[PDB]
C-alpha cells in the first residue's frame, strides 16, 4: 500500500530500505526472551543491548539460523518488528515488502517467508535472490545482455552469481562466510594463548586487524582484546597483530575463492569474456576483509570491484525493484 520497503534479512544485522528515504533500519537480527517464561522481551538493538547488560537472565534467539528461516514464530515476530520500525509509527497502512532470499532455496522454505511477511504486516510481499537485489542496488544493468558477476559474502553464506538478461545463469552457494571467519579468530586465540574470547570480540578483532594479504601495512595493524584465561579462570588481555591472524583467516577464505573459481568454469564463455573485462563485483558485510579483493584477483585473474556500499546494497535493491515492473512481474508473489 502506501510505503514500499525492501528488507535484507541477515544473520548479522537486518537492514530495511524505505523508498523515498533510504536505509531507515540497521539493527542486529536478535530477540531476547526471559530465560524462564519464554517471554519475548526485546527485539533488535534494544536486544543486543540488554543481552550485554543481563546475559544471565536471557536466552538470545537468532531467527535466521543458517540462510533461511528456522524458528518461524520468532521470525514472524522479528519480521513484524522491522516492518514496523521501518513503517514509521505515524504510518498506518500495510506496506509493500520485497525480501531478499538466498539462491538455493526450496519452494517450501519460500512459501514460508512469504507467509511470515504477510502475517508480519505486509499488504503484499515479493522475494528476490540476494545477488539480483545487490546488482540492482548498485546500478549495474541486469536487463542488459552483458555478463555480470556478483559475490555476496554475508555472515551465513557466500553466494556467487552470474547475471545476464534480468536472470541468473550460474551460481554457487556455500556455507562459509564471516561467521566462519569470526570462528577462526576465536579458535586461534584459544589454541595459541590459552584465552577464551567470544562473538562480539572476534567480530571487532576481525574489523580492526583482519586481513588475508601480506604487506608491511597489514602486519603492523594491532589491537587489544579481553577474555578469560581457560587455565586460571581469570581475565586476561591480549594484543593481536594483523600478522598472526592472517594465517587462520586465509584457510577459511580459500573455500570462498574455490567457490568463485568453480563458478567461472561452468560459466558460458561469452559471459566470461564480459566478466574478465568488467570484473567481479564483491559485496556484502562478509566481504570487508583486508586484501580479500587482492587475494581474489591473484587467484582467479579477474579484477575485483568492491561495492561502495557493501552493507546496504541488497536492501536498496529490494526497494529499487518495486519500480522495475519488468523485473517485478518476474518475482514470486503473495498479497
Amino acid at each position: 500500500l502506501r510505503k514500499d520497503i525492501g528488507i535484507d534479512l541477515g544473520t548479522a544485522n537486518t537492514l530495511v530500505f524505505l523508498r523515498g528515504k533510504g536505509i531507515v533500519v540497521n539493527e542486529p537480527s536478535v530477540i531476547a526472551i526471559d530465560s524462564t517464561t519464554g517471554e519475548i522481551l526485546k527485539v533488535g538493538l534494544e536486544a543486543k543491548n540488554m543481552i550485554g547488560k543481563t546475559p544471565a537472565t536471557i536466552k538470545a534467539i537468532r531467527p535466521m539460523r543458517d540462510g533461511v528461516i528456522a524458528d518461524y514464530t520468532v521470525a514472524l515476530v522479528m519480521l513484524r518488528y522491522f516492518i514496523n520500525k521501518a513503517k514509521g509509527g505515524m504510518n498506518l497502512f500495510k506496506p509493500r515488502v520485497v525480501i531478499g532470499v538466498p539462491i538455493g532455496i526450496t519452494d517450501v522454505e519460500r512459501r514460508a517467508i512469504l507467509d511470515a511477511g504477510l502475517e508480519a504486516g505486509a499488504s503484499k510481499v515479493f522475494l528476490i535472490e540476494e545477488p539480483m537485489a545487490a546488482a540492482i542496488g548498485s546500478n549495474l544493468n541486469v536487463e542488459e545482455p552483458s555478463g555480470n558477476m556478483v559475490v555476496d559474502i554475508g555472515g551465513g553464506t557466500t553466494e556467487v552469481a552470474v547475471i545476464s538478461l534480468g536472470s541468473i545463469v550460474t551460481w554457487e552457494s556455500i556455507r562459509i562466510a564471516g561467521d566462519e571467519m569470526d570462528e577462526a579468530i576465536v579458535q586461534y586465540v584459544r589454541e595459541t594463548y590459552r584465552v577464551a574470547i567470544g562473538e562480539r570480540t572476534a567480530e571487532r578483532v576481525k574489523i580492526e586487524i583482519g586481513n588475508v594479504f601480506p604487506s608491511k601495512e597489514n602486519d603492523e595493524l594491532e589491537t587489544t582484546v579481553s577474555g578469560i584465561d581457560l587455565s586460571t579462570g581469570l581475565p586476561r588481555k591480549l594484543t593481536l597483530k594483523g600478522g598472526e591472524v592472517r594465517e587462520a583467516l586465509r584457510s577459511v577464505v580459500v573455500a570462498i575463492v574455490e567457490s568463485v573459481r568453480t563458478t567461472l568454469e561452468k560459466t558460458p564463455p561469452e559471459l566470461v569474456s564480459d566478466i574478465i573485462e568488467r570484473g567481479i563485483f564483491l559485496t556484502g558485510g562478509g566481504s570487508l576483509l583486508r586484501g580479500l579483493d587482492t587475494l581474489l584477483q591473484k587467484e582467479t585473474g579477474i579484477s575485483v570491484i568492491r561495492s561502495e556500499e557493501p552493507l546496504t546494497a541488497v536492501a536498496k535493491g529490494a526497494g529499487m525493484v518495486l519500480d522495475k515492473v519488468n523485473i517485478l512481474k518476474k518475482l514470486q508473489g503473495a498479497g
Binding site: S138, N139, L140, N141, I276, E277, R278, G279, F281, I302, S303, I305, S307, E308
Partner: protein, 87 residues
C-alpha cells in the same frame, strides 16, 4: 566533463610517456582499446555502468604510474560538473 577531459588527458599523456600502445594497455588491463580511447578523449557518459566505469579508471591508473584516488576524485568532480549543469 571538462574535468573528465582533463582526466583522459592525463591518462593519454601518461601512457605515451612510455612505449605503450592502446592495444598493449588493453592486454594488461583486460579493457578494450575502444573503451580506453573514449576514456582518454574524456567521453564517459554511457561507457558502461557507473560501478564499472569507476573500475576501469582504477585499473588504468594502477597500470600507469597514476594515483588511483586523484583520478577517481576527478571522475567524481566530473559528475557533479554535469550535475550542477542540469538544474
Amino acid at each position: 566533463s571538462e574535468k573528465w577531459k582533463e582526466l583522459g588527458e592525463t591518462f593519454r599523456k601518461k601512457r605515451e610517456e612510455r612505449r605503450i600502445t592502446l592495444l598493449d594497455a588493453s592486454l594488461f588491463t583486460n579493457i578494450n582499446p575502444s573503451k580506453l580511447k573514449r576514456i582518454e578523449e574524456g567521453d564517459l557518459k554511457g561507457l558502461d555502468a557507473e560501478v564499472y566505469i569507476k573500475s576501469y579508471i582504477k585499473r588504468y591508473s594502477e597500470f600507469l604510474e597514476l594515483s588511483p584516488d586523484e583520478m577517481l576524485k576527478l571522475y567524481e568532480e566530473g559528475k557533479e560538473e554535469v550535475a550542477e549543469e542540469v538544474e
